């Protein structure tokens, strides 16, 4: 802990810097808690025996915390910077440091007593506000300033600091602060808004009165006696001891008698016995299943319900060809005659008109579609057959068709038609999009994607998707008797006949093909057999439910993803064509089958095989037992596929149960030998198996309404209802050894709460309840009623909807929540804390919760959703916030602290290594819970919450929780309808009143419920309870480990991580001998196994889906930590990467398409696969835009080709390398600098839309969506009539829009009255995209509508935007870097990325296979904790209304506002005037426009190989696994000697002497090299061929003087230059011109000219330096001369409309000629700490051609050691200076008192003041040194939480005593691990040189001086006031 290394870490560039704030937290074990003895008395305070002063104790909180930092002499602001006289010259910093490179560093520390990011961010912002302006003022008047600013803020939780540190110093600081804050508080300003909110909430809580008596009445078991008796009485001890002993002996006996530890068999015998038992169990299951079924041996049927046809698509057309013959369409008749009649009727005249036009479906020209009805009179036989149309299978069925289908099948062979209509229509758009990056990489990847699209599988899937879209469209028409509809598929010779229904739940269709254009077939045999008709081939009226439609639409964009992902995972090159590996056909075929055949209970087997395969990772003491998965596999079978899957699964189980997975740690790493695919016979590595358990995964939110799934849901909801204990005794009143299905022991709950509370109170400092209460009161008291969770779901279920058939033949139609806030705002309420006072009473007058149900269709996941009513949400939101607040400050929970998801597992390894010695062994168990819902009686939650509250909340929480013990649930009306015509057979009887059941009333349309928490509602209380339980488990395990089985003590650390349901335990030990390892492994095995039996006490039932006692692997949520290797299932997000999403505006879909891609990249995928996924995403986005439905797609394609702007349908594709890295904003930025888009945006910002009040003004109305901006024609869409009608029912005058423009002040301040609240509601109801139309139909049709409607409407007619071509001609009525930066607030990072990206334009690399696993890094891209910048909207609120939403300051506020004005032309400082000039029509469009103009991309946690890392490394490695992508020593010593001479104490003449001699002796490479900084070096070295062109070319900086002003003589002898001159120059290829003028006291800048504008922000400071050289002020104004880009005052940016300062008028041909300078007047110069090569252009006026300043990262030591071994350099205190190492200190002891030297003067005294550096290694404070006797923190220990001692069961003790176990024979076999040399667990985790050199350049100056200062004294020198002999050293020091 020293300041020198810390300040040496940071490197700064010229100017002022603030860096980036970073957040460090607690990782290692907290030290501290010493003997604390605080006694306040007269002399102050006392601690231990050291006494501190009282008023010093008033500030010890900061002095002690930073004792090792402030050791300087307390300089001032004036002493370092030039005087500004602005009052701030007396601003005293906390540490002002100036290292030997002039890099000024001002740092101030702070300490807050908060507990979250809130106080941290607050302190950071207030420190920045305190110290912003003076330092900027001082840096504005310096020559070459390099000043850094840093802030340090600490808290008991974490530390926020912009200067990089190491976790050790963070831990030191945090624990020091803990001690300091403790002694501070034992020894003993907010704003106004929060000060009002706290009182507003406290008043309500103090006067809140819930009717506890009516509550006890209307609710079963709500009694305050339970709560008070739980809080008051302590916890029993003897009961717990006997219960633990009983549970322990029971678990031990169960383990022994379940894993065959009796009596003596070896491992192989136990394994064969296990194999026999598994065989028996599978045999029994098969027999019991086959016994109840129609026993068959062959079932002729199919699996794919569609016929295999592969036509060659012809020219596109939507019309039925007529000339077909009929010579054979009457062979069969009953189907052929139907098609014959159809063709004959459509031929001549029988068709009719049915228009299905987009504008209808959204419920609002030639875009209208034409469909044909039908009425063909069929014969009686065929009519009867059609009216006729429209048992569980056996495990032994000989399903071999599926078998040999997955072996040989033409599924991946190339369909020879790869250049046809559809492929052209896609590839053209693809090439147009990719034209931005025309490298070889992009061409290769596009060719690979097209080759993939050419395979016959996607060719078959394409027309299937077309058919599915057409059917979804035709789903809801009008049905005539005997009607039909004939349609063509617009790309293929296929015809479909459709017969819709009225139920709108399925459909009937029949296909037909010409039988002469069927080119190929999929040559399978699981396919629906068609029929022959001569020259035709037809189908037989299948039926497809409406639920199984989206999966048919999304078929190509999942087949492509599967093909690409599996082709890459196998290890094939994405740019090298090969054959199908015959191990790849299986995976693709299986994906195809599981996708097409879409049911539950079929993919469920595959998603369940994981828990079966998750065995074999079990440790020798136990055996792999997959037989626990029998059950959940029973039930009926209804497909030929389920039988095959079940047989293969059972075979995999019996294969696994015979031998586990091997475990061989060859080198220091560990692996696992034998793995294999689940449904196959294979052998693949881990990563190939892990994400094979996720074959049939997908997501949706469509709200399926099939009666079957809804019935299963209703069944699941009521399962444990009848299991009520029927006794209000064991539900929170007394203890119980064996608890029943819903009971829980109270004393154990109290013990767990006490344990967790002690852990919390030890991590944070005590007296924490107060901080929590204030935090909760604040966070509640600020919730306005308007900013609620609008657009959510509510329930219109009241008492009236309780009698079926009395309210039926109606629709429920659940509604939104906005209506509630509307009808509340009407009633005069503003704050959320006001509505609850009546919402609670309104609820209590009822007797239920009025819950409604909701179910999506995703076959698995989080399917159920329980929507509530507003009166319940309003009371639940006030309690869930308290729950989340109490949960946020826990050390285990991972749903409020999300980052801990990836910290408590990795870092554990380091922890294990810390207090164990390297070489430990892990023992892990990943648990779960069986029924996390329907098993938690809601009283335990209330108790465990009220235990953590300050008692001002007890009554409110008790009431608001007591509302969950009688809830009513709605049901579908169609459900009861069809039901009133097994479990369902009981439900119908309960409904009809025959059989009495205890939930459903007779005749009533609901379901009662008394037990079970709802899912999603009480999300955090469950996590809190689980945290308590897991903390108790951790304490108990630490206890049992503290004392061995026989009085010994095994050593080991425990870790506990847990979220909502899933949880893990990660114990780790270290043995020494061989036998002790065995004993400890057995002990920890029993310990970990006891959890299953210890769980039921807390009302938690562990399932059979949890592994136990695995050696070197865990699994928390979905990621598997296989030792130092982390595996994540990437198929999950890949499959769920293209979800249909209904948003009312374009350019908002690509946002989500990029979000999902970024999520997939996070999940982990080489960029070469992310790019293909993006191509498939583009294909999906275009197919969902009318690619195969509307016939007018050619016109839209032609329009988009000539207009690449998004929001019109165009899709932007990222760079091949670094594809999904940065979000959509990056692609937008990159496209806005190369395409015509840069033009279309420029017009939006540089047009004053007056236009003489023409008919071309405003152009596209400003309207931003998401991050992008577009025309208001799109964002205005959507029905809102219900909402505005409701508003008109209230006091909303129609003038409101106009009435808003008269006073915009109501759009930024919150509220003052009721009326402006209504105005804010009205603006809320129109802007973002809030909808009101009911989802009365499907999604795909109405999405295609919402697309094509807007597209067409913009293409031809108006809205107020113009046509496409009209706007294109309005163009002829791009961006400059200023506005480009103001738009994208992260342009610099984008530029860095792009620069690093413009080197991989070729395909060059090697296939080097590295070691087993390159342990990667944890790289984070652009990402900050909170923020530092002011948003582009707050400046307007401040300038326009005076609200200091930002706190910059008058100078800085003016500067940034002026920059903003210079960014937007029309923008003025008048809120009313800015409407009649800028593109807008109302003063509301601008409010929405400005709040989303600037947007930043999202963060990315990408992994990269180490070297610690960079982005170039990641791009080298991560492009493809197993593949990389790629394209002196005198310079170092020269840099070192240059830095040591320039900054060294010398004289300028002597400096130049030594420099030129060093240049003479040394050599250098020629300048035909890389030019970053050595260019200048080799130039100034070769200045001793022809230098003129050397400086001219190769990016120099020079320029003559074309027009000298004049010469004039001031009588004080001054050569002044007066008049008007013209200077010219050529710096970094600009050829600028500078007109200058001055006639009074000095000169001033007149005008500047530039030939280009790329490098603008650097030319500005270059011109600043040039004027500083030639000495010209830049303060006075000028007379504007032309149409300038911008103007500049004080080297600052000013707009052109202001005409304030010198204007920079860029003219490409402004000035093109050079000055032809003479090469003889060239000199070298050496200023203090500055090297220059210059030329005198005029008499007394010089010009610096080139400059140099040495960095601090070039102070070498090898070069120093070499220079030491040299004598010829007569150049070398100097000897001990350059070469760090008769005497030196003896002569200069008195040389400072009398100046007698021929060398440096003051510089030597400034340098030698560094004795404080060597004095920094010692001489600390007293309390800072006496308190180093602290021992580490031992642990939590249940003898403390329970306050008593506890004995334990010595079963294993007496067993090993008698010898009934023979442990040494159980583990014989499997390898030994105590002596195995392995690396520690965990995967993830210039300081070196800078620290070394900063600690190094001290000794070589004060070696013997330190010895003298130690010899003279060692104890009194620690004090500074005590000395106030060795007058020479003190003089050297100071004074």
Residues forming the site for Mg ion (CB under 5 A): 614, 926, 928, 1062, 1115
> 1812, 1827, 1815, 1821: which is closest to 1913 by C-alpha?
1815
Determine which one of 127, 769, 856, 1251 is catalytic: 127
In contact, 466 and 1427? CB cutoff 8 Å: no
Number of residues in the chain: 1935
CB count, 10 Å around CB of 1364? 16
Tokens 């003590």 found at = 1049
Comparing CB distances to Mg ion, the nearer of 767 and 1117 is 1117
What's the closest the beta carbon of residue 1321 comes to Mg ion, in angstroms? 46
Across the strands, what pairs with 537? 513, 532
Q: Is 1447 a catalytic residue?
A: no
What's the closest the beta carbon of residue 1223 comes to Mg ion, in angstroms? 32
In contact, 594 and 695? CB cutoff 8 Å: yes
What's the closest the beta carbon of residue 697 comes to Mg ion, in angstroms? 16
Q: How far is CA 1719 from CA 1598, 1734, 1742, in A?
A: 12, 11, 14
Across the strands, what pairs with 41? 44
What's the closest the beta carbon of residue 1371 comes to Mg ion, in angstroms? 59
> 1878, 1881, 1884: which is closest to 1113 by C-alpha?
1881
Q: How far is CA 293 from CA 215, 396, 635, 985, 1537, in A?
A: 54, 11, 11, 20, 92
CB count, 10 Å around CB of 511? 20
Q: Which parts of 1266-1348 are beta strand (E)?
A: 1268-1271
In contact, 1350 and 1277? CB cutoff 8 Å: yes
Comparing CB distances to Mg ion, the nearer of 1105 and 1631 is 1105
What's the closest the beta carbon of residue 1865 comes to Mg ion, in angstroms? 30
What's the closest the beta carbon of residue 1062 comes to Mg ion, in angstroms? 4
In our burial notation (b when 16+ CB lie closer than 10 A, e otherwise), range 857-869 reads: bbbeeebbbbbbb
Please state the φ and ψ torsions of residue 345, each to the nearest 5 degrees.
Answer: -70, -45
Residue 1125 annotated in ligand binding? no
Q: Would you give the end-to-end CA distance of the chain in angstroms?
A: 27
What sign does the dihedral 113-119-124-130 (CA atoms) show?
A: negative
Comparing CB distances to Mg ion, the nearer of 955 and 1132 is 1132
What's the closest the beta carbon of residue 610 comes to Mg ion, in angstroms? 7
What's the closest the beta carbon of residue 275 comes to Mg ion, in angstroms? 22
Gap between the Cα atoms of 647 and 656, Å rounded: 14
Residue 928 annotated in ligand binding? no
What's the closest the beta carbon of residue 613 comes to Mg ion, in angstroms? 9
Comparing CB distances to Mg ion, the nearer of 614 and 1300 is 614
* Residue of closest CB approach to Mg ion: 614
What number of helices (H) and strands (E) belong to the chain? 71, 45
User: Kindly report the CA angle at 1440 between 1438 and 1445, in degrees rounded to 5?
Assistant: 20
In contact, 9 and 163? CB cutoff 8 Å: yes
Please state the φ and ψ torsions of residue 916, each to the nearest 5 degrees.
Answer: -140, -20
Question: How many CA atoms lie within 13 Å of 1073's alpha carbon, on the beta-carbon side?
Answer: 7
| Structure letter (DSSP) for residue 1147 | T
Comparing CB distances to Mg ion, the nearer of 476 and 1121 is 1121
Gap between the Cα atoms of 391 and 292, Å rounded: 10
Comparing CB distances to Mg ion, the nearer of 442 and 926 is 926
Gap between the Cα atoms of 1061 and 1450, Å rounded: 53
The string of DSSP codes covering 1469-1505 is: S-TTGGGTTSS-SSTTHHHHHHTSSS--PPP-EE---
Gap between the Cα atoms of 879 and 718, Å rounded: 26
Binning the chain into helix, strand and coil, the percentages to the nearest 5 are: 40, 10, 50
What's the closest the beta carbon of residue 1106 comes to Mg ion, in angstroms? 6
Gap between the Cα atoms of 574 and 576, Å rounded: 6
Structure token pair of residue 1709: 């041909």
In angstroms and rounded to an integer, the radius of gyration of the C-alpha atoms of the chain is 40
Comparing CB distances to Mg ion, the nearer of 685 and 1860 is 685
Comparing CB distances to Mg ion, the nearer of 927 and 1890 is 927
Comparing CB distances to Mg ion, the nearer of 742 and 908 is 908
Comparing CB distances to Mg ion, the nearer of 112 and 1107 is 1107
Residue 108 annotated in ligand binding? yes
Comparing CB distances to Mg ion, the nearer of 718 and 1065 is 1065
Residue 1809 annotated in ligand binding? no
Q: Which residues have a Cβ under 8 Å from the Cβ of 1841 and sit 6 or more positions away?
A: 751, 754, 755, 758, 1035
Comparing CB distances to Mg ion, the nearer of 490 and 892 is 892
Alpha helices, H only, 1043-1074? none
Gap between the Cα atoms of 1509 and 1507, Å rounded: 6
> 1639, 1707, 1699: which is closest to 1673 by C-alpha?
1639
> Residues within the annotated binding site for Mg(2+)?
1062
> Residues within the annotated binding site for Mn(2+)?
62, 94, 108
> Residues within the annotated binding site?
62, 94, 108, 1062
Which residues are marked as active site? 127
């Amino acid at each position: 802990m020293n300041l020198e290394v810390l300040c040496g870490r940071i490197n700064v560039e010229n100017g002022l810097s603030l860096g980036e704030p970073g957040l460090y937290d607690q990782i290692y074990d907290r030290p501290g808690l010493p003997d604390l003895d605080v006694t306040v008395d007269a002399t102050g305070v006392t601690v231990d025996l050291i006494t501190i002063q009282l008023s010093e104790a008033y500030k010890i909180n900061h002095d002690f915390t930073f004792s090792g930092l402030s050791k300087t002499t307390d300089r001032r602001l004036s002493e370092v910077f030039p005087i500004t006289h602005d009052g701030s010259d007396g601003m005293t910093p906390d540490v002002i440091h100036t290292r030997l490179d002039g890099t000024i560093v001002v740092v101030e520390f702070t300490t807050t007593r908060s507990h979250n990011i809130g106080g941290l961010e607050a302190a950071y912002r207030t420190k920045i506000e305190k110290y912003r302006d003076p330092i900027s003022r001082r840096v504005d008047i310096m020559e070459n300033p390099r000043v850094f600013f840093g802030v340090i803020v600490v808290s008991s939780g974490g530390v926020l600091s912009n200067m990089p540190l190491t976790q050790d110093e963070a831990e030191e600081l945090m624990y020091r602060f803990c001690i300091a804050n403790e002694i501070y508080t034992k020894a003993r300003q907010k704003s106004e808004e929060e000060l009002e909110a706290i009182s507003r909430a406290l008043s309500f809580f103090s006067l809140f009165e819930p009717n506890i008596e009516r509550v006890e009445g209307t609710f079963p078991n709500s009694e305050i006696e339970m709560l008070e008796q739980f809080l008051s009485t302590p916890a029993d001890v003897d009961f717990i001891t006997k219960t633990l002993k009983a549970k322990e002996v029971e678990a031990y006996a169960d383990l022994c008698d379940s894993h065959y530890l009796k009596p003596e068999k070896t491992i192989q015998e136990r394994l064969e016995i296990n194999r026999c038992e598994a065989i028996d169990k599978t045999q029994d299951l098969l027999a019991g299943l086959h016994a109840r079924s129609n026993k068959q041996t062959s079932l002729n049927r199919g699996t794919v319900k569609l016929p295999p046809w592969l036509p060659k698509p012809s020219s596109e057309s939507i019309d039925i060809k007529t000339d077909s013959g009929f010579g054979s369409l009457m062979d069969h008749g009953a189907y052929g005659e139907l098609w014959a009649k159809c063709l004959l009727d459509v031929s001549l005249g029988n068709v009719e008109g049915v228009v299905s036009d987009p504008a209808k479906e959204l419920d609002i020209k030639e875009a209208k579609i034409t469909y044909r009805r039908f009425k063909p009179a069929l014969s009686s036989s065929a009519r009867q057959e059609f009216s006729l149309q429209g048992d569980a299978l056996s495990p032994f069925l000989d399903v071999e068709d599926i078998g040999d289908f997955l072996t040989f099948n033409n599924l991946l062979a190339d369909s020879r038609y790869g250049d046809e209509s559809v492929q052209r229509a896609v590839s053209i758009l693809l090439e147009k999009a990719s034209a931005m990056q025309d490298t070889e990489l992009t061409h290769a990847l596009n060719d690979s994607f097209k080759r993939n699209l050419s395979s016959n599988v996607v060719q078959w899937s394409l027309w299937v998707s077309c058919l599915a879209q057409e059917l979804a469209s035709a789903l809801k028409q009008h049905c005539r008797a005997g009607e039909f509809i004939i349609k063509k598929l617009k790309f293929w010779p296929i015809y479909v006949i459709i017969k819709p229904t009225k139920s709108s739940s399925h459909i009937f269709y029949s296909l037909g093909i010409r039988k002469a254009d069927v080119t190929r077939r999929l040559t399978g045999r699981v396919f629906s057999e068609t029929i022959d008709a001569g020259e035709w081939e037809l189908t037989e009226f299948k039926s497809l439910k409406t639920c199984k439609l989206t999966n048919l639409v999304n078929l190509p964009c999942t087949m492509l993803n599967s093909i690409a992902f599996w082709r890459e995972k196998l290890g094939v090159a994405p740019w090298l064509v090969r054959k199908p590996c015959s191990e790849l056909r299986e995976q693709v075929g299986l994906t195809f089958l599981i996708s097409l055949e879409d049911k539950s209970k079929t993919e469920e087997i595959i998603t369940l095989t994981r828990y079966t395969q998750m065995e074999g990772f079990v440790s020798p003491p136990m055996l792999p037992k997959p037989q626990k998965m029998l059950g959940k596999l029973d039930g009926p079978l209804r497909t030929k596929l389920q039988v095959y899957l079940l047989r293969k699964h059972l075979d995999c189980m019996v294969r696994i149960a015979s031998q586990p997975f091997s475990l061989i740690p060859r080198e220091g790493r560990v692996e696992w030998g034998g793995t294999f695919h689940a449904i196959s016979g294979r052998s693949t590595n881990l990563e190939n198996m892990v994400n094979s358990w996720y074959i049939g995964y997908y997501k949706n939110k469509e709200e399926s309404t099939e009666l079957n799934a809804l019935g299963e849901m209703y069944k699941k909801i009521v399962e444990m209802e009848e299991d009520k204990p029927s006794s209000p005794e064991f539900l929170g009143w007394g203890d119980t050894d064996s608890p029943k299905k819903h009971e829980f022991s109270r004393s154990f709950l109290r013990a767990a709460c006490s344990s967790l509370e002690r852990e919390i109170a030890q991590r944070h400092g005590r007296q924490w309840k107060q901080n929590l209460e204030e935090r909760v009161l604040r966070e509640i008291g600020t919730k306005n009623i308007l900013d609620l969770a609008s657009m959510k779901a509510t329930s219109n279920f009241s008492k009236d909807w309780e009698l079926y058939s009395e309210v039926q033949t109606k629709e429920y139609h659940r509604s939104k929540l906005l209506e509630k806030m509307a009808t509340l705002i009407e009633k005069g309420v503003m704050w959320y804390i006001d509505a609850v006072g009546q919402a609670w009473k309104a609820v209590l007058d009822d007797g239920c919760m009025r819950i409604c149900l909701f179910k999506k269709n995703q076959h698995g996941g989080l399917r159920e959703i329980y929507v509530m009513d507003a009166n319940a949400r309003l009371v639940q939101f006030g309690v869930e916030t308290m729950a989340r607040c109490v949960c946020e400050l826990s050390p285990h929970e991972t749903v409020a602290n999300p980052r801990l998801k990836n910290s408590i597992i990795e870092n554990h390894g380091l922890k294990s290594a810390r207090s164990l010695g390297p070489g430990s062994i892990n023992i892990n168990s990943s648990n779960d819970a069986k029924k996390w819902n329907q098993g938690h009686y809601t009283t335990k939650l209330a108790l465990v919450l009220c235990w953590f509250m300050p008692a001002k909340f007890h009554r409110f929480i008790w009431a608001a929780i007591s509302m969950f013990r009688r809830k009513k649930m709605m049901v579908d009306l169609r459900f009861l309808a069809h039901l009133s015509s097994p479990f369902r057979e009981a439900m119908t009887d309960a409904f009809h009143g025959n059989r009495e059941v205890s939930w459903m009333d007779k005749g009533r349309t609901y379901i009662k419920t008394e037990t079970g928490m709802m899912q999603g509602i009480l999300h955090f209380t469950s996590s809190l309870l689980h945290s308590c339980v897991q903390s108790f488990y951790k304490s108990y395990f630490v206890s049992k480990l503290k004392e061995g089985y026989m009085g010994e003590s095994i050593s080991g650390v425990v870790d506990v991580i847990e979220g909502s349901d899933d949880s893990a335990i990660m114990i780790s030990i270290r043995p020494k001998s061989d036998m002790d390892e065995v004993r400890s492994r057995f002990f920890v095995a029993n310990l970990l196994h006891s959890v299953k039996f210890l769980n039921p006490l807390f009302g938690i039932y562990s399932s059979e889906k949890s592994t136990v006692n695995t050696v070197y692997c865990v699994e928390y949520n979905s990621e598997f930590h296989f030792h130092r290797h982390l595996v994540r299932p990437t198929l999950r997000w890949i499959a769920a990467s293209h979800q249909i999403s209904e948003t009312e505006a374009l350019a908002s879909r690509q946002e989500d398409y990029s979000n999902l891609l970024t999520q997939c990249l996070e999940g982990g995928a080489s960029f070469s696969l992310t790019y293909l996924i993006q191509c498939a995403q583009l294909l999906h986005h275009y197919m969902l835009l009318g690619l195969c439905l509307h016939p007018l797609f050619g016109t839209f394609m032609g329009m988009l080709i000539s207009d690449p702007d998004p929001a019109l349908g165009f899709f932007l594709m990222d760079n091949p390398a670094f594809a999904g890295g940065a979000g959509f904003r990056f692609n937008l930025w990159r496209a806005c600098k190369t395409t015509d888009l840069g033009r279309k945006y420029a017009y939006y910002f540089n047009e004053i839309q007056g236009k003489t009040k023409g008919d071309e003004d405003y152009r596209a109305l400003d309207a931003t969506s998401g991050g992008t901006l577009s025309h208001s024609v799109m964002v205005y869409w959507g029905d809102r009539k219900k909402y505005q009608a409701l508003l008109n029912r209230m006091g909303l005058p129609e003038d409101w829009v106009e009435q808003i423009d008269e006073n915009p002040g109501v759009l930024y301040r919150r509220a003052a009255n009721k009326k402006e609240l209504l105005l804010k509601l009205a603006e809320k109801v129109h802007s973002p995209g809030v909808t009101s139309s009911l989802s009365k139909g499907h999604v795909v049709p109405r999405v295609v509508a919402a697309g094509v409607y807007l597209l067409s409407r913009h293409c031809f007619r108006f809205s107020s935007t113009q046509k496409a071509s009209l706007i294109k001609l309005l163009m002829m009525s791009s961006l400059n870097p200023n506005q480009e930066r103001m738009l994208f607030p992260q342009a610099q990072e984008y530029d860095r990325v792009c620069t690093l990206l413009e080197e991989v334009e070729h395909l060059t690399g090697k296939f080097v296979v590295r070691e087993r696993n390159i342990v990667r890094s944890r790289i984070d891209l652009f990402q900050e904790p909170v923020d530092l910048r002011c948003k582009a909207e707050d400046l307007v609120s401040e300038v326009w209304f005076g609200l200091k939403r930002t706190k910059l300051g008058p100078r800085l506020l003016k500067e940034e506002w002026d920059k903003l004005r210079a960014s937007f032309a029309w923008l003025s400082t008048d809120p009313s005037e800015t409407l009649r000039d800028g593109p807008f029509l109302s003063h509301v469009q601008f409010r929405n426009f400005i709040a989303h103009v600037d947007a930043k991309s999202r963060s990315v946690r990408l992994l990269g190989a180490p070297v610690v890392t960079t982005i170039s490394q990641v791009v080298r490695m991560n492009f493809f696994p197993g593949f990389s992508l790629e394209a002196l020593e005198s310079i170092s010593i020269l840099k070192h000697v240059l830095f040591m001479v320039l900054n060294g104490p010398y004289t300028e003449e002597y400096k130049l002497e030594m420099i030129i001699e060093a240049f003479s002796t040394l050599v250098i490479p020629q300048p035909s090299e890389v030019i970053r900084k050595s260019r200048t070096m080799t130039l100034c070295l070769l200045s001793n061929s022809i230098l003129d062109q050397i400086e001219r070319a190769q990016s120099g900086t020079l320029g003559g003087f074309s027009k000298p002003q004049k010469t004039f003589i001031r009588p004080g002898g001054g050569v002044g230059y007066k008049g008007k001159g013209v200077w010219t120059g050529v710096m970094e290829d600009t050829h600028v011109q500078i007109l200058i003028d001055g006639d009074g006291t000095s000169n001033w800048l007149e005008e500047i000219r530039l030939s280009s504008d790329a490098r603008l922000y650097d030319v500005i400071e270059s011109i600043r330096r040039l004027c500083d050289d030639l000495g010209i002020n830049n303060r006075v104004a000028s007379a504007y001369r032309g149409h300038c880009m911008v103007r500049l005052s004080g080297f600052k940016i000013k707009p052109a409309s202001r005409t304030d300062g010198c204007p920079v008028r860029i003219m490409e041909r402004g000035f093109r000629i050079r000055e032809l300078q003479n090469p003889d007047e060239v000199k070298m110069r050496v200023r203090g700490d500055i090297l220059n090569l210059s030329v005198t252009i005029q008499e007394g006026r010089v010009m610096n051609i080139l400059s140099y300043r040495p960095r601090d990262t070039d102070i070498s030591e090898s070069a120093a050691a070499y220079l030491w071994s040299n004598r010829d350099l007569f150049s070398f205190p100097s000897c001990s200076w350059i070469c760090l190492k008769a005497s030196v200190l003896l002569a200069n002891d008195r040389k400072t008192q009398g100046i007698d030297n021929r060398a440096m003067g003051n510089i030597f005294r400034d340098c030698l003041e560094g004795s404080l550096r060597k004095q920094g290694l010692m001489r600390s404070k007293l309390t800072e040194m006496v308190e180093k006797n602290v021992v580490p923190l031992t642990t939590q220990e249940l003898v403390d939480i329970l306050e008593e001692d506890i004995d334990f069961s010595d079963v294993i003790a007496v067993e090993l005593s008698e010898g009934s176990l023979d442990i040494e024979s159980i583990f014989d076999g499997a390898p030994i691990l105590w002596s195995a040399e392995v690396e520690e667990f965990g995967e993830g985790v210039t300081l070196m040189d800078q620290a070394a050199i900063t600690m190094c350049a001290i000794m070589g100056k004060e070696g013997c001086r330190g010895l003298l200062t130690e010899k003279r004294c060692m104890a009194a020198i620690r004090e500074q006031v005590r000395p106030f002999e060795d007058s020479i050293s003190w003089v050297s020091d100071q004074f």
